[PDB]
Amino acid sequence: SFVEMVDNLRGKSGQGYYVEMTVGSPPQTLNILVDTGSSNFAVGAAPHPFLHRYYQRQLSSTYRDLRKGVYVPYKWEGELGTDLVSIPHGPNVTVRANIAAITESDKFFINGSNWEGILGLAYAEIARPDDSLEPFFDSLVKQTHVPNLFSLQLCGAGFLASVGGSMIIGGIDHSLYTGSLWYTPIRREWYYEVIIVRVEINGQDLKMDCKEYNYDKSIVDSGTTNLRLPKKVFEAAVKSIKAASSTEKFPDGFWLGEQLVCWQAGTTPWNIFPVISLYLMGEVTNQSFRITILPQQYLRPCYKFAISQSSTGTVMGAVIMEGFYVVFDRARKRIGFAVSACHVHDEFRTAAVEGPFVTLDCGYNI
Ligand SMILES: CN1C(=O)[C@@](c2ccc(OC(F)(F)F)cc2)(c2ccc(F)c(-c3cncnc3)c2)N=C1N
Numbered sequence: 001s002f003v004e005m006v007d008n009l010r011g012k013s014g015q016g017y018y019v020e021m022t023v024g025s026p027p028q029t030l031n032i033l034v035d036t037g038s039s040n041f042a043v044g045a046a047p048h049p050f051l052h053r054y055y056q057r058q059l060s061s062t063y064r065d066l067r068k069g070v071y072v073p074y075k076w077e078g079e080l081g082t083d084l085v086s087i088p089h090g091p092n093v094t095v096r097a098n099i100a101a102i103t104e105s106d107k108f109f110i111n112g113s114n115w116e117g118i119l120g121l122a123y124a125e126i127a128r129p130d131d132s133l134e135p136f137f138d139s140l141v142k143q144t145h146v147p148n149l150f151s152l153q154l155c156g157a158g159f160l161a162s163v164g165g166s167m168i169i170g171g172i173d174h175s176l177y178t179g180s181l182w183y184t185p186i187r188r189e190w191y192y193e194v195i196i197v198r199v200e201i202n203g204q205d206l207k208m209d210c211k212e213y214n215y216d217k218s219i220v221d222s223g224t225t226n227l228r229l230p231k232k233v234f235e236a237a238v239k240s241i242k243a244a245s246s247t248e249k250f251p252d253g254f255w256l257g258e259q260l261v262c263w264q265a266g267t268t269p270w271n272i273f274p275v276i277s278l279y280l281m282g283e284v285t286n287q288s289f290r291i292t293i294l295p296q297q298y299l300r301p302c303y304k305f306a307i308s309q310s311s312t313g314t315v316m317g318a319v320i321m322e323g324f325y326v327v328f329d330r331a332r333k334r335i336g337f338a339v340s341a342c343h344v345h346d347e348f349r350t351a352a353v354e355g356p357f358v359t360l361d362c363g364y365n366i
Contacts, residue, residue: 002173008089009034009165011113013157013301014225017165017318018115022086023099024060029053029088031115034152034167036192036328037221037315039127041085041136043117045078045101050109053116055101057081066098072128076105080133090169093144097136100128112160118223121150121328125190137330146170148331152222153177155342156322159266161301165342177325177338182289182355184280186333187363191219194335195281195362196314197288199233201240202274208233210362217313217364220326220335224317226257227276227298228310237276237307244274254305262302270295270346278316282356283334289355291337293323296344297351313364323351 010031011017018031023043030043030053044054057063066080078100085097102108102117109116124131124138134142141148147170154165166176187193196213199206215230229237238255248269253259263269273295279288297319300306306319323343327336343351 002168002171005089005168006166006173006176007164008087009154009167011115011163013161013163015110015113015160016115016223016225017154017163018113019090019119019167020088021117021119022088023055024057024083025062026059027086028055028059030055030117033115033118033223034121035118035221035223036121036152037219037223038118038120039122039124039135040072040100040118040120040133041097042076042078042100042102042120044105044109046103048105048109050111050113051116055099055117057083057101070100070129076102076108078102078104085136087169090167091140091144091146093140093146095136095140095143097139098133121222122191123189140169149327149329151176151325151327151336152321153325153340153342154222154318154322155340156297156318156344157301158344172327176341178341179339179353181325181327181336181338182280182353183283183327183329183334183336184289185283186330186335189333191217191221192328192335194218194220194316196278197281197359197362198279198290199237200277201237202244203277204240206233206236206240208236211364213314214362215313215364216366218316219313220316220321222318222321224315225300225319226306226308226315226317227320228308228315228317230314231309231311233314234307234309241274245272247272257305257308260302260304268303271348273299275349278320279357280337281362284356286359287356288359289337289353290357291320291324292352292354293320294345294349294351296346297323324353
């Protein structure tokens with residue numbers, strides 16, 4: 001039942017959401033980052049200054065060595081193998097999954113994040129060292145009767161700050177959202193790639209060729225904190241946001257996501273910052289639906305501007321997902337969005353999912 005899966009995610013603001021998992025026999029308990037932006041099950045497997053726990057292969061009676069190393073600059077190095085894996089507050093099953101045992105790394109783990117590994121939930125095409133290394137979720141579906149679908153409700157903090165959420169594996173929990181679920185097609189099965197057809201700041205269209213929004217791609221990534229936008233789109237966005245909040249301005253170190261901005265105890269002028277609407281391509285070619293996010297989402301806790309520039313396409317990260325219940329419907333190659341039961345909002349504005357909006361070529365081919 002999904003009830004036992006509710007609130008199975010925890011984390012620190014800006015450091016990602018993790019789920020408890022066990023690996024090996026007897027079960028070794030570890031906290032694992034839920035990451036829709038990668039496809040490896042990679043776990044710390046050797047002492048590290050930021051790790052308080054790590055996977056000890058020699059303690060597992062069920063560990064099997066694949067006699068194959070892996071080098072991943074992007075960095076971390078490790079040895080490939082397989083072992084039994086379970087999610088205590090997920091489905092009641094045990095699967096034999098590939099595991100990359102990380103023996104050395106640089107700038108990979110985060111101090112105080114309280115996770116020791118990453119659960120890459122994306123597709124095999126982007127798995128390291130290649131696509132023959134079956135990702136965890138693929139193993140899970142193939143080995144069990146679990147439906148090929150999972151959903152994420154990231155809730156952030158609300159009033160480093162602690163965050164919480166739910167990962168529901170194998171179905172949709174209706175208690176986690178209100179209103180309608182709107183679906184955007186998964187363009188290609190590598191990252192969770194989608195297509196943005198329009199974006200507006202306070203109802204004002206940025207008026208860009210929609211290819212700009214997906215240059216060179218747009219992905220949904222729980223493993224990225226910020227909403228990351230292509231250079232040209234980012235500049236247009238900041239300008240519009242700056243203008244809307246012109247009433248008393250801020251340092252540019254803030255707009256660059258460097259410096260923080262501070263008011264005190266519920267004096268934050270949310271109403272000065274505009275809402276941002278991302279229109280996603282619908283299941284019907286000429287249709288779209290918009291997800292609308294509040295300053296409560298893109299200003300993350302004093303606050304930091306959680307929108308930043310990208311040279312690798314648009315990334316709809318945690319701060320975007322935190323407004324919504326997000327359904328990764330792998331079985332039907334689509335991603336669903338609905339207003340989250342947990343999202344933060346004031347008494348004048350709320351996050352929204354609304355459609356359809358019809359138009360009269362937005363993908364950046366590959
Ligand atoms: C964008 N991104 C990362 O850089 C990564 C990552 C990079 C390379 C990987 O190994 C490969 F390449 F083999 F897949 C696997 C995953 C990542 C790595 C470490 C992190 F602390 C975070 C992170 C940091 N703060 C908040 N939340 C997540 C993200 N996860 C995502 N989505």
